[PDB]
Symmetry: C2
Subunit: 495 residues, 2 copies
Amino acid sequence: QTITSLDPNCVIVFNKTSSANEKSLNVEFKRLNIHSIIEPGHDLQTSYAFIRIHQDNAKPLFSFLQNLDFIESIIPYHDTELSDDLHKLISISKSKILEAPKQYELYNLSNLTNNPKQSLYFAFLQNYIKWLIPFSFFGLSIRFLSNFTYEFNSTYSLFAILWTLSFTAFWLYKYEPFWSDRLSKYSSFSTIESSVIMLKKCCFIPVALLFGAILLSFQLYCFALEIFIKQIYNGPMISILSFLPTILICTFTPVLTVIYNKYFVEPMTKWENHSSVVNAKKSKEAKNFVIIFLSSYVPLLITLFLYLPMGHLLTAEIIDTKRYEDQFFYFIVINQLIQFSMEQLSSSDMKIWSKVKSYQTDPWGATFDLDANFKKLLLQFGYLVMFSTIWPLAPFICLIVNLIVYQVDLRKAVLYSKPEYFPFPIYVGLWNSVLVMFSILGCVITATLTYMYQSCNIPGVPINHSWINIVLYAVFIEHVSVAIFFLFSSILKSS
Amino acid sequence: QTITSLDPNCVIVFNKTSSANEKSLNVEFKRLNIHSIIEPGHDLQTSYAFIRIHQDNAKPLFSFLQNLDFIESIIPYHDTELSDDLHKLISISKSKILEAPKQYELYNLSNLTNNPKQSLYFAFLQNYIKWLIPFSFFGLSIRFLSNFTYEFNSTYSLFAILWTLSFTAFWLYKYEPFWSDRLSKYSSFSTIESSVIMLKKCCFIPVALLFGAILLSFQLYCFALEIFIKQIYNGPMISILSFLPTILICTFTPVLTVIYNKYFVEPMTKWENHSSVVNAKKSKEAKNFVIIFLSSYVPLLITLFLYLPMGHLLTAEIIDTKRYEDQFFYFIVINQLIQFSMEQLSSSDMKIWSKVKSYQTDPWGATFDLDANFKKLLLQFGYLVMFSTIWPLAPFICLIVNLIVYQVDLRKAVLYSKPEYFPFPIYVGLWNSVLVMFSILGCVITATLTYMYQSCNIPGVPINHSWINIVLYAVFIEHVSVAIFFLFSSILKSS
């Protein structure tokens, strides 16, 4: 018998160190009911177990495997016909690439892959693209038909606020209920398988605040150094010194992140002692999102809320009128492009063996990480909601990047990602609250920015207002946005 | 057979105009299974039906009554043993009146009467008294031990904010879930027995805003008239003209609310066309709370936030240093006292007949109104949360009034109120959101008042700050309070 003729439904990868003992021999007798073949693993301390299971002899095998406690991992490998079906789904997906993804495609993927975790992220991306199409069209129209005042235009900002609140409410209370119903409704088997915890988690707030203060102070100092070298420093090599601010932040941020995770995030997450590992990973992601937030948006907020307004004060011991334009260009086009760029057995038996090996070793063969894929989308959303009023072409670039990212991620998560959910039944959370916070913050910042710079004294865009009126308007916009979001949430929840 | 020997468990009161037709005989024929006695009602167009039911022949009778559509009301009248037990419970309640009511008494009351609404209201009052006892002791201590600066003391204000947030969170997420579990857990029979509705309700927001603007403008005009009369008016009858402001406000508020209800609240509520009459009553109460809020809290807010600070500005075309003191005294002692003050058959057969008469006619015999009894408590809570920093004796007066009100309301709702829930099983909402709003607003107002008047230039208590810092502090306190409330809610909900 050969692996190809077997058409395995699952691989029981165990450490070959334990398979040196006859436990691997014993599990063969335990598998007297279903065919199995054992082959050496990727390394000398692993050995694959290509087995085929049905809906009948599924629960006993996993009930044994739970107590076996000598298995490295378990993968619900796709068989030949399922692999062909998913290849055909991908082939249908690649055609009409420029067109928005269609809902019925996601239903086929959810019925075939049976992965609610993938379905949730892909539904979020589909909703994002569908809502971004009208925003992209509106941005193009306001940029071209109303090119006279394409920067900080009142109508575009009203549309941005309304679109942000409506999209957040619609996703939270009209689509996410349906799609997350599949998280527990199907929940066939994730192959991975109280108040004191919340009290302990609250104790990390001062630590996050302190580290955010450290990061903010360093970034402010780096901005001061950059403005120094670019305005009032008269050295010969201007260009060479211009790289110092970028390398300084690009070397301090990873160091701060690594010390943060090594000494604060990991020990405190261990101290919390979460029941399930998924909760521990979610808590670590939530704690680590503060650094990402303060490293992604802080430079633009410093350039906009400070620098441009208060530059005239710091003349004693001419501001760049277009600094924010190129900064936003770099953070909305170049940065997203970079992120996309960096992120004796027979031939068929060897193909299956290499597929399992890629599932176990290669970075693209790792299991679908919903958190790391939601984080990039939410960061792009924050960029599109907080600063699209600067450049109305941000929705269009975001839409194009989203289409490319969707077409790449579908292929990766379907063909190469290690499966997690079996077809046969056997025995979002943080990114919603972060999305809501991003929506409110984006509405506030957009309204405040357009109040500030609609009649700004800087040519081609100081403020004809005071530091009191701006803050009062920001508070008013925050309150009105919260009220509008509450009304939308109630209206959509009643359905 | 006599009514006393019958010991009725329920009265089927039907209109005697319909009982002129032989339907009174038809229901008697249906009542061939359980004993029944029919007597003339309170008026010539009503007739009582003293009947006794058990858990067996109860559902068919009530299904007949539902199909009958000629009944006036149905009352689960207490029998002799239940009446004696409730009399004993009241007799136990009256003793230890000055002591806080005990939980086992409420457990006995809920087991005997089986009324979830009464249990909920009395649980709220019990929790309120229990939480107000330490606040009362703290107020006494700060008034007497720290009498030097008893007005607007920082420690008392911090305690007020913390106590408010903790009380709201504890009631919402530790006691209310348990007590409201009995709302549907028992739910034996209330004898009374979607997106378009929410959209239609939202259309009333501009109407409420317009009416609130009208009321606020009128109250501001009357405040200006009062300050003119008492400060810049040199007429002979200074005392007689002092009554005119109060007379004007007390005649304009009732006509304003009567036109509000007759022209706006009723037509719009009918337009929404709520399925249940309970929802209609709740919606009518919610819209009418804006007028009550603006009639109760605005004058003190006008006296504190305005008048005292800006009195010097309006000197041209000496402010009362104790105006707010006497106003708070009147609104926290006298007003609550006024509210409490203003709010051939045998002898036993006559007693039962008169009891049914009182159930059907007398105002104290009306069914227990949870909304009208929650509203008074919430208004007192709003006063105590917004303005107790002025006079630290407010918690003590509130506790005394609450104990008296509880001892009166237990007797009323137990002995005299018409019952709604049967023992045999047969086939809060607005005041929580209002409570949370009162908590946040009270924290904000207390903090702002303490900031303003701790170092006020008015003797015996202009502001050493500006109109910017005060608003900034108010916004900061609102955000901090909402964050603290969210943390408390999460901590208590995880349990």
